[PDB]
């Protein structure tokens, strides 16, 4: 029992008991980072894939025409010296070195143990490690970016149908897309005219016989082993045939096969049935007599070269004819090798593909694959062989992991799961056998929309591939540099280069699409952006490449891929999510656990089951009747065996579900009543919850799902307790806890600091902060919540707030799906939000004059100079209005060519002719708030501003203050430990002296430790950071806008009901009941029939019941009753039909008062997704708290006062706040600066541009029969020179003439057309 559960317990309604606790959410990226980095390991590291596996495949090298070797035992990880809270405010991006030890061993180039000169030394730091935090994110140059799990196609060969318009046939085979892990993309297309032709990226179509002859297999042996295995002889009655009963099954025999010494099997014109097959099986006659007319349709496998004749009488892979059989008879051929194909058997398409284009020589295939790669070049056998080896056999620019060989072995059939990483010709034999088996029709075709055909990758494999590419580039550079060098003439450190791997690890996080910016506006976005499964990026399908193939789901995703979590817009279906209980495998495969059930009893152990065995095994349903004996009471349950739902027997199943929340992801599972909603609007509500923003007062959610505390625990913004103990002092800047004597070491017992995250900037310009929820003098446990982040309160996830909500169309304010608020939300500041707005200003150095932070700026009034100091920066916490100068930036100018009007207005006012302009940045329109802090970065060895000195002195006194308070708490812990030690038998004496000396040594070690920590902080804060070149000082001011509720804000609930508020209506216009609480936010009753979600009504009914119980316990606490009445009240609450009771455990004085003070503001529920609360417990909870049972309240009309002749429904709806406000989208522009290619306005002049008046806008404009505004908006608003001037003069003077003129768009067009030399003239 945790300490947070004593303050808040959740009334659950799960009729099914919980058999498995919710696992770690971000463990996949955690152990992927642990496998790729290998920070904590022994001297014998793991042999799995990663940076060590990428280094061990390349680092043993041999010099061409020389003797050189490089050995390594391992690498050494670097120590992260940059603090996270100082690198988000300085810009260090978590730099961490990585040094390796290379052994340069030389030889005498004779393959013997002679001249063994080994030089074992540590090399330079190969790049910089990312060094991500424990939360699962890493900072990339100030901002925090995360990786996305690439859900590309699985490595291997698939065989689908792909019926399209290009084939123009009902039954056709698709192209075999061989997909390796990196590089060497090969294709195998099946031609419709009984042929097979491979394809390439840029080359044309090539036959499969040339590919086999280039791989190494001869055409005759491949044509023999491809079709069948049958030999023909000439013995006895002029021919001898080997009869096969398997090939003759289902074939209409048109000839006589009466051989067998007077026993006829099938007569002429009789179909071969199973009786003739059984007769041939019981006879066993291997020799049959056929006429010579049947041999004409057969095709030979190899060339028939008789040794007596001396010439080739039959070509390789050719048909037999009436003269060819006579030639083979007269040439005295003993054994004839030919293929046997039937209509009921597989069609001989491989022989027809091998017989095409006369491909029978190895040199012809070599020059064909040389012309396919480099056409029109010098045909060389060695160069083409080396190119084919580097493309197929060698690992040069080609990396394939073992999962592709595992998928190929699972496809073609093999007992060994692990295969070789290099491709061979035997895999080509398996894939040709697989494609002719697919063209025969046996087996099942693969589905490209399956979970097995879409592998979920991570950052580790792609990072290892990029590091391997950079490492083979550095190895090629070192081999090119050390070609003519020697051992004593060169150096092992100077020959290596860590620059290509540093450039590769730079582009892997800076210019890669997979390392996009992390959505940190909401903790749900923070936990779901790690678990995104996107198909885009390199080696995947983009938005236009999706079609109708990867946007659909197969029922093999039972507990693996959640389809109710994808971003709405232009990409739905190809970007997927990861489920809750789904755990990836070692091979990167998505697997889900299942409960093994026998015929009589139910087992306890759980095994993670893959997708390849679920197609053969039966999977039952966990939502079944159980009589507490381990058996199903029903005789028929909805099960699935062949990836399709059906009905089965309870003694026939073998597996069932673990939990019903294993199929849904963590985005949609936070919405209650998922089984009452449709997946469309639940997906929309999950998307708006992922795109949510925090609030000011974090009110706890009324109707909860139970996993709110779990998703608050796994979130990195919360404060997790490493060790338990009592809490000494709680502060909003930092908290400290004591360490008990059980879970502690000998020395340095009490050491626990927790720097709370102050008001800093997120990625979507929203504020983040940590609020403590504990007291002084209380004990905690391991993993306890100390301080909750934004949109989290007192240990649970608390995103928005709740208010009284009814379902009524009220005066057209909630017209279709709109919102009508009340004055309580603006008077109590409930759903208001505060954004932190960034403003990055640079102070660069130009060639005509440098810039600096100088407060003496020309054209500055009194209201601007009063805010800024003698330095040039506004003070901490000043009110910033619209159109205020914040930063100080003066740029010089020379030869400005000033007008006489400007010097006249300068000489009238008597001001000095300042030749230095003012290019200081200002706020946009609609921003009027208060700044909180400013972060300044300067270069190393440059002049520093006095505001920078004030900032660094405030930071150093804050750092010294927290160092002093942690030194104070550790010396208080040491003194209380010594005082608890000396009281035992005080009245031997050598031990006490020893312990005092050990305590003095410990406190002096802590003193010198804080001295070197302060020295490190001073040497890290006084130095300069790596900034952009040409910049003297980089400042950034953090402006916080205190935004309130305005008419037009975005408001949506939890079930996908998007709406906009209308105005600020008062508290009296809304209808009220007889109790005294008027309704606040009124919704429309169209959200329930149109959007297919009835969970609105159930959620608002449970919210009404929860507010009834909360008001009852509030008036019970007001009435000053005893604790026996409160525990009887909790007993009659927690003894419903659903869920379980956890009463009679908490103490009355502490825990009961704690749960009262922490549950007076509402109680949370705990409902599952597919076996949640039924309606009868909701009717009981409505009827026990003096509320109507159907939600049929009787309300009073506030507007007209007439009594309603109908009962209404009110309640409480927990809604969310969105990042769809008006202030970030408002563009305020009347006149904007025109562009350079045409006279169209654009941004950049401290004003946002307009919208795109493209083709559809002007099409809808000329939809009506008008012509004057079409040219007015095209020659007056844009694309003119003097037309706007004469029209403004006509507007100012008043008279209108409407002169036509000549626009500049015709001038741009005539220049762009006469750039090609085109005669254009006017007739007139």
């Amino acid at each position: 029992y945790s300490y947070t559960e004593k303050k808040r317990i959740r009334k659950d309604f799960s009729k099914l008991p919980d058999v498995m606790d919710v696992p770690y959410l971000l463990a996949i990226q955690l152990d992927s980072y642990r496998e790729f980095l290998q920070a904590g390991a022994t001297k014998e590291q793991f042999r799995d894939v990663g940076l060590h596996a990428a280094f061990k495949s390349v680092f043993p090298i041999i010099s061409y025409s020389g003797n050189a070797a490089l050995e390594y035992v391992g690498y050494r990880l670097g120590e992260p010296a940059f603090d996270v809270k100082e690198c988000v405010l300085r810009g260090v991006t978590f730099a961490v070195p990585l040094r390796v030890k290379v052994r340069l061993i030389i030889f005498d180039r004779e393959s013997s143990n002679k001249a063994i000169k080994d030089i074992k030394e540590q090399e330079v730091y190969m790049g910089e490690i990312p060094l991500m935090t424990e939360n699962g994110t890493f900072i990339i140059n100030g901002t925090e970016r995360v990786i996305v799990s690439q859900l590309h196609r699985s490595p291997g060969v698939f065989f689908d149908h792909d019926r399209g318009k290009t084939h123009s046939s009902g039954k056709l085979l698709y192209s075999a897309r061989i997909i390796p892990y990196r590089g060497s993309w090969l294709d195998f297309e099946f031609d419709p005219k009984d042929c097979v032709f491979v394809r390439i990226d840029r080359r044309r179509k090539l036959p499969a016989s040339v590919l086999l002859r280039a791989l190494g297999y001869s055409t005759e042996e491949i044509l023999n082993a491809f079709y069948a295995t049958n030999v023909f002889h000439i013995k006895g009655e002029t021919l001898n045939l080997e009869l096969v009963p398997q090939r003759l099954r289902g074939e209409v025999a048109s000839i006589d096969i009466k051989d067998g010494s007077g026993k006829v099997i099938v007569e002429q014109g009789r179909r071969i049935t199973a009786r003739h097959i059984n007769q041939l099986e019981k006879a066993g006659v291997s020799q049959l007599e056929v006429p010579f007319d049947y041999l004409i349709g057969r095709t030979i496998a190899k060339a028939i070269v008789h040794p007596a004749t001396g010439e080739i009488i039959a070509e390789c892979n050719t048909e037999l004819t009436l003269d060819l059989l006579a030639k083979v008879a007269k040439a005295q051929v003993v054994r004839i090798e030919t293929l046997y194909t039937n209509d009921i058997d597989c069609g001989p398409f491989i022989s027809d593909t091998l017989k095409i284009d006369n491909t029978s020589n190895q040199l012809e295939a070599l020059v064909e694959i040389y012309r396919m790669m480099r056409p029109g070049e010098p045909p060389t056998k060695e160069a083409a062989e080396t190119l084919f080896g580097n493309l197929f056999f060698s690992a040069e620019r080609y990396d394939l992991s073992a999962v592709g060989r595992m998928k190929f072995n699972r496809r073609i059939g093999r007992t060994e799961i692990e295969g070789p990483g290099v491709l061979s010709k035997e895999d080509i034999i398996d894939v040709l056998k697989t494609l002719v088996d697919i063209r025969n029709g046996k087996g099942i075709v693969d589905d490209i929309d399956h979970l097995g055909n879409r592998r979920v990758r991570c950052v580790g494999e792609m990072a290892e591939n990029q590091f391997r590419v950079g490492l083979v580039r550095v190895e090629r550079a070192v081999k090119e540099r050390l070609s003519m060098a020697e051992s004593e003439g060169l150096m092992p450190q100077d020959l290596i280069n860590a620059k290509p791997v540093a450039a590769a690890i730079k582009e892997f996080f800076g210019s890669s699409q997979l390392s996009q910016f992390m959505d940190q506006n909401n903790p749900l976005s923070e936990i779901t952006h790690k678990r995104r499964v996107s198909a885009l990026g390199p080696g995947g399908l983009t938005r236009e490449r999706a079609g109708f193939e990867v946007r659909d789901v197969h029922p093999t995703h039972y507990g693996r891929v959640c389809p109710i979590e994808t971003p709405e817009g232009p990409n739905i279906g190809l970007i997927n999510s990861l489920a809750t209980y789904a755990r990836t495998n070692k091979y990167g495969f998505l697997e889900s656990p299942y409960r093994v059930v026998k015929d009589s009893l139910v087992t306890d152990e759980i095994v993670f089951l893959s997708a390849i065995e679920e197609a053969d095994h039966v999977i039952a349903q966990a939502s079944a009747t159980l009589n507490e004996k381990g058996q199903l009471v029903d005789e028929l349950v909805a099960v699935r065996h062949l990836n399709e739902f059906t009905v089965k027997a309870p003694e026939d199943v073998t597996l069932m579900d673990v939990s019903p929340k294993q199929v849904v992801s963590v985005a949609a599972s936070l919405i209650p009543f998922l089984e009452h909603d449709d997946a469309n609007r639940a997906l929309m509500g999950s998307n708006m919850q992922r795109q949510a923003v925090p609030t000011l007062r974090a009110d706890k959610p009324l109707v909860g799902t139970g996993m709110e505390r779990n998703v608050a625990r796994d979130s990195g913004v919360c404060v997790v307790a490493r060790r338990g103990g009592v809490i000494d002092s709680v502060d909003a800047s930092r908290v400290v806890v004591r360490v008990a004597d059980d879970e502690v070491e000998t020395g340095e017992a009490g050491v626990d600091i927790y720097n709370l995250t102050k008001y800093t900037r997120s990625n979507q310009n929203t504020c983040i902060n940590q609020r403590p929820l504990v007291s002084k003098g209380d004990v905690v446990a391991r993993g306890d919540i100390l301080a909750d982040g934004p949109s989290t309160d007192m240990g649970e996830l608390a995103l928005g707030q709740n208010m009284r909500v009814a379902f009524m169309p009220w005066n057209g304010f909630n017209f279709e799906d709109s919102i009508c608020l009340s004055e309580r939300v603006v008077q109590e500041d409930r759903f208001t939000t505060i954004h932190i707005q960034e403003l990055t200003c640079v102070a660069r150095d130009t060639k005509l004059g440098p810039e600096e932070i100088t407060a003496d700026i020309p054209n500055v009034g009194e209201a601007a100079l009063n805010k800024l100091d003698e330095a040039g920066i506004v003070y901490v916490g000043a009110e910033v209005q619209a159109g205020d100068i914040l930063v100080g930036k003066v740029t010089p100018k020379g030869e400005t060519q000033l007008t006489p009007e400007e010097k006249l207005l300068r000489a009238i006012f008597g001001e000095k002719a300042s030749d230095v302009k003012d290019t200081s940045l200002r706020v946009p329109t609609g921003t009027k708030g208060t700044v909180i802090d400013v972060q300044v970065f300067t270069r190393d060895g440059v002049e520093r501003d006095s505001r920078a000195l004030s900032i660094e002195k405030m930071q150093l006194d804050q750092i010294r203050k927290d160092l002093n308070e942690e030194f104070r708490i550790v010396e208080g812990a040491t003194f209380e430990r010594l005082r608890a030690a000396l009281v035992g038998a005080k009245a031997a004496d050598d031990a006490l002296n020893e312990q005092l000396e050990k305590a003095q040594a410990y406190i002096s070690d802590r003193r010198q430790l804080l001295d070197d920590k302060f020295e490190d902080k001073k040497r890290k804060l006084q130095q300069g950071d790596d900034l952009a070149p040409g910049v003297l000082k980089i400042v950034k001011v953090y402006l916080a806008i205190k935004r309130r509720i305005q008419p037009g804000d975005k408001m949506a609930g939890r079930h996908g009901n998007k709406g906009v508020v209308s105005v600020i209506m008062p508290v009296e216009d809304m209808p009220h009941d007889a109790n005294g609480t008027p309704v606040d936010i009124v919704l429309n009753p169209l959200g329930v029939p149109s959007r297919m979600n009835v969970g609105q009504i159930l959620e608002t009914h449970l919210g009404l019941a929860a507010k009834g119980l909360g008001e009852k316990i509030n008036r019970m606490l007001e009435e000053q009753r005893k604790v026996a009445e409160l525990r009887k009240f909790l007993h009659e609450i927690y003894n419903e039909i659903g869920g379980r009771e956890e009463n009679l455990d908490e103490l009355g004085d502490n825990e009961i008062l704690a749960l009262a003070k922490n549950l007076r503001g509402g109680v949370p529920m705990a409902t599952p997704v597919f076996d949640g609360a039924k309606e009868r417990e909701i009717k009981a909870m409505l009827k026990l708290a003096d509320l109507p049972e159907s939600g049929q309240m009787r309300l009073f009309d506030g507007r007209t006062g007439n009594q309603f002749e109908r009962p209404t429904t009110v309640g409480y709806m927990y809604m969310l706040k969105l990042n769809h406000l008006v202030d970030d989208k408002m563009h305020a522009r009347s006149t904007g600066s025109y562009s350079l290619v045409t006279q169209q306005p654009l941004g950049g002049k401290a004003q946002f541009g307009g919208q795109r008046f493209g083709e559809m806008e002007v099409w809808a404009l000329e939809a009506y029969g008008a012509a004057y505004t079409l040219q007015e908006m095209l020659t007056v608003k844009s694309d003119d020179v003097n037309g706007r001037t004469k029209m403004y003069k006509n507007i100012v003077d008043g008279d209108h003439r409407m002169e036509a003129g000549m626009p500049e768009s015709f001038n741009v067009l005539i220049k762009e057309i006469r750039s090609l030399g085109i005669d254009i003239e006017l007739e007139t």
């Binding site: 070195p97 330079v124 730091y125 910089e128 480099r374 056409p375 029109g376 070049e377 010098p378 450190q493 100077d494 290596i496 280069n497 860590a498 620059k499 699409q513 996009q516 885009l536 990026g537 150095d845 060639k847 020309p858 054209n859 500055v860 009034g861 009194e862 209201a863 159109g883 100068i885 007008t899 006489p900 009007e901 010097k903 006249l904 207005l905 000489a907 009238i908 006012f909 008597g910 001001e911 190393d940 060895g941 790596d1026 070149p1029 040409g1030 006149t1231 904007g1232 600066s1233 025109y1234 562009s1235 350079l1236 290619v1237 306005p1241 654009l1242 941004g1243 950049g1244 002049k1245 541009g1249 001037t1285 403004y1288």
Partner: protein, 278 residues
């Protein structure tokens, strides 16, 4: 089918280049000295293997390989044009040095948009070479402080020298793979091209024209002739001493009292310093 490319066609065309003994090149250089259009043609059509071997080393640059083989044969023909056979050595090293000079000129003139002379690109090349040498032992990002300490140069000087290296990217390759919006419509010009700026210019011109027409004649004349606003040139009282007033102090006092009158009528018209210069 056949290849519709140029590099393959060039590689097939250069296959007929012979490589005889050095006495043939000695005789060709002797015949090219007196003047004949056969030895120069043979030297330009029989020595392309060294040209393509030079051009294969300068791959992955801001140019194309056709430009590299063109500067190679241009340096070769400039080497054999003014070729002196009195040394009696091989002209392959001379053609190699000429091709090195031509590829240095190609790096100088065909890489960056801003053109550079020889000395600044030479000091940029040795500075980037020194940075490449020191970054192998530094194992971090190259900063100008260590380069200035190693090269015995001031930090501001090497900062101004590295400031010339712009390395400008494209205007269509935006941030990210999905280039839904280019960088042409992002930034604007630095000059005043807004209709607000020109509108304020013409309104201020008409306003000061009305204020000069509403003032006295002598004050408007001394305000228009001195600054050159109302159809006047760039002349002053030293040039208008025989035009308006002979004494410079008298017309200077008239000018400053006219400026004070303009300031007081702007103050009475609702125009102050804070309302004009923010």
């Amino acid at each position: 089918t056949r290849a519709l490319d140029a590099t393959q066609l060039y590689l097939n065309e250069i296959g007929f280049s012979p490589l005889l003994t050095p006495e043939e090149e000695v005789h060709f250089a002797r015949l090219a000295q007196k003047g004949d259009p056969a030895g120069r043609k043979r030297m330009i059509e029989s020595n392309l293997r060294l040209v393509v071997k030079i051009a294969r080393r300068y791959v992955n640059r801001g140019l194309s390989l056709l430009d590299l083989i063109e500067e190679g044969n241009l340096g070769l023909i400039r080497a054999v044009e003014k070729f002196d056979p009195e040394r009696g050595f091989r002209f392959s090293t001379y053609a190699t040095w000429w091709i090195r000079q031509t590829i240095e000129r190609a790096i100088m003139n065909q890489t960056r948009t801003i053109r550079l002379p020889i000395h600044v690109v030479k000091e940029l090349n040795v500075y980037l070479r020194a940075a490449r040498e020191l970054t192998h032992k530094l194992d971090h990002e190259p900063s100008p402080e260590e380069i200035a300490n190693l090269l015995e140069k001031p930090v501001a000087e090497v900062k101004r020298m590295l400031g010339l290296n712009e390395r400008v990217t494209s205007v269509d390759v935006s941030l990210g793979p999905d280039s839904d919006k280019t960088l042409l419509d992002t930034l604007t010009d630095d000059r005043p091209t807004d209709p607000c700026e020109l509108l304020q210019d013409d309104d201020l011109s008409e306003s000061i024209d009305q204020w000069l027409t509403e003032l006295t004649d002598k004050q408007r004349e001394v305000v228009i002739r001195r600054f050159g606003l109302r159809g006047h040139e760039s002349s002053t009282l030293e040039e208008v001493g025989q035009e308006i007033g002979l004494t410079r102090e008298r017309v200077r006092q008239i000018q400053v009292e006219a400026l004070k009158r303009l300031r007081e009528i702007l103050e009475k018209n609702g125009l102050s310093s804070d309302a004009l210069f923010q």
